[PDB]
Structures are given as structure tokens and as C-alpha cells.
Paper text:
As the most abundant plant‐derived protein, soy protein isolate (SPI) provides an ideal model for structural studies, with glycinin (11S globulin) and β‐conglycinin (7S globulin) as its major components. Further dissociation of glycinin into its acidic (A) and basic (B) subunits showed that fibrillization was strictly mediated by the acidic subunit (glycinin‐A), which produced well‐defined fibrils, whereas the basic subunit (glycinin‐B) showed no assembly propensity under identical conditions. Removing the Pro164–Ala190 segment resulted in markedly poorer fitting, underscoring the necessity of this region for structural integrity. Together, these structural and computational analyses consistently identify glycinin G4 as the predominant fibril‐forming protein in both polymorphic forms.
PM1 exhibited a characteristic twisted architecture with an 800 Å half‐period twist, corresponding to the 90 nm pitch observed by AFM. Structural analysis further revealed that Val186 resides within the PM1 dimer interface, where spatial constraints favor small residues (e.g., valine in glycinin G4/G5) but exclude bulkier ones (e.g., arginine in glycinin G1/G2/G3). PM1 features spatially segregated hydrophilic (Asp172‐Asn178/Asn178’‐Asp172’) and hydrophobic (Val166‐Ile168/Val186’‐Pro184’) domains, a structural motif distinct from previously characterized amyloid folds in both pathological and functional contexts.
Numbering used by the authors:
A (entry chain E), B (entry chain C), C (entry chain A), D (entry chain G), E (entry chain I), F (entry chain B), ...: 164 to 190
Write the structure that this text describes.
Amino acid sequence: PVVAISLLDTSNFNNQLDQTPRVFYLA
Amino acid sequence: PVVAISLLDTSNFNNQLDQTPRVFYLA
Amino acid sequence: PVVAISLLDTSNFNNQLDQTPRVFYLA
Amino acid sequence: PVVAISLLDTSNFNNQLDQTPRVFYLA
Amino acid sequence: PVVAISLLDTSNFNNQLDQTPRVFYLA
Amino acid sequence: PVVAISLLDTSNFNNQLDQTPRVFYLA
Amino acid sequence: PVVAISLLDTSNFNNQLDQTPRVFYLA
Amino acid sequence: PVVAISLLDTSNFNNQLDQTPRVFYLA
Amino acid sequence: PVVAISLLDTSNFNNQLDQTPRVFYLA
Amino acid sequence: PVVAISLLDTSNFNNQLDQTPRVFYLA
């Protein structure tokens, strides 16, 4: 009976990318 | 009976991208 | 009986993109 | 009865990328 | 009965990449 | 002068998802 | 002068997902 | 002068996922 | 002058996943 | 002058995963 062909291609989830640089160009 | 062909292509969810730089160009 | 062919292509949901830079160009 | 062919290709989840440099260019 | 062919290709999860350099270019 | 803060969150492009099953339920 | 803060979060592109099963339920 | 802070979080590209099972349930 | 802080977190590219089982349930 | 801080976290590329079992359940 039960036949289950599954293809789960997930990516890029539940992730936090924090880019908070501090550049002080004092000419 | 039950035949289930599934193709789940999910991406880019439940993720926070915080880009809060601080640039101080003091000429 | 039951035959279920499913193709779920979801993307870019439930995600917050915060871009709040602070640029201080003091000529 | 039960036959289950599964192909799960997940990547890049539940990971935090913190890039917070501090550059002090004092000319 | 039960036949289960599974192919799980996961990568790059639950890992934190902290790059916080401090560069002091004092010309 | 030139200060460029960019945040490009792109996903799910230039990819073909072909689901062409063949089910023969010969009761 | 040139300061470039960039955050490119791309995913799921230029990839083909072919799911072409053949199921013969000859009851 | 040139200061370049870059964060490239790419994943899941240029890869083909072929799932072509052959199931013969000859009851 | 040139200061380049880069963080390249790439994964899961240019790889083929072929799952082509052959199941013969001859009841 | 040239200062280059780089962090390249790559994984899971240019690799083929072939799973082609042959199961003969001759009940």
C-alpha cells in the first residue's frame, strides 16, 4: 500500500546574520 | 492504495538579517 | 485509491530584514 | 507495504554569522 | 514490508561564525 | 566620499523543478 | 574614501530538481 | 581609503537532485 | 589603505545527489 | 597598507552522492 516518495530541499532558514561594523575614518 | 509524491523546495524563511553599520567619516 | 502529487515551492517568508545604518559625514 | 524513499537536502540553518569589525583609520 | 531508502545530505547548521577584528591604522 | 551599504537577499532563481511521475494503478 | 559594507544572502539558484518516479501498483 | 566589509552567505546552487525511483508493487 | 574584511560562508553547491532505487515487492 | 582578514567557511561541494539500491522482496 503506502508508497511515499519525498524530496525536501530546504535551505537558509532560522539563521541570523548580524553585520554591525564601526568604521571611524578620521581624515 | 496511498501514493504520495512530494517535492518541497523551501528556502529563506524565519531568518533575520540585521545590517546596522556606523560609519563616521570625519573629514 | 489516494494519489497525491504535490510540488510546493515556497521561499522568502517570516523573515525580517533590518537595515538601519548610521552615517555621519562631517565635512 | 510501506515503502518510503526520502531525499532530504537541507543546509544553512540555525546558524548566526556575526561580523562586527572596528576599523579606526586615523589619517 | 517496511522498506526505507533515505538520503539525508545536511550541512552548515547550528554554528556561529564570529569575525570581530580590530584594525587601528594610525597613519 | 563613496559610502555604499548594500543588502541583497536573493533566493530561488534560475532553477528548474521537474516533477514528472508515472503512476500505474492497475487494479 | 571608498567604504563598502555589503551583505549578500543568496540561496537556491541554478539548481535542477528532477523527481521522476515510476510506480507500478499492479493489484 | 578603500575599506570593504563583505558578508557573502550563499548556499544551495548549481546542484542537481535526481530522484528517479522504480517501485513495482506486484500484489 | 586597502582594508578588506570578508566572510564567505558558502555550502552545498556543484554537487549531484542521485537516488534511483529499484524496489520489487512481488507479493 | 594592505590588510586582509578573510574567513572562508565552505563545505559540501563538488561531490556526488549515488544511492541506487536494488531490493527484491519476493514474498
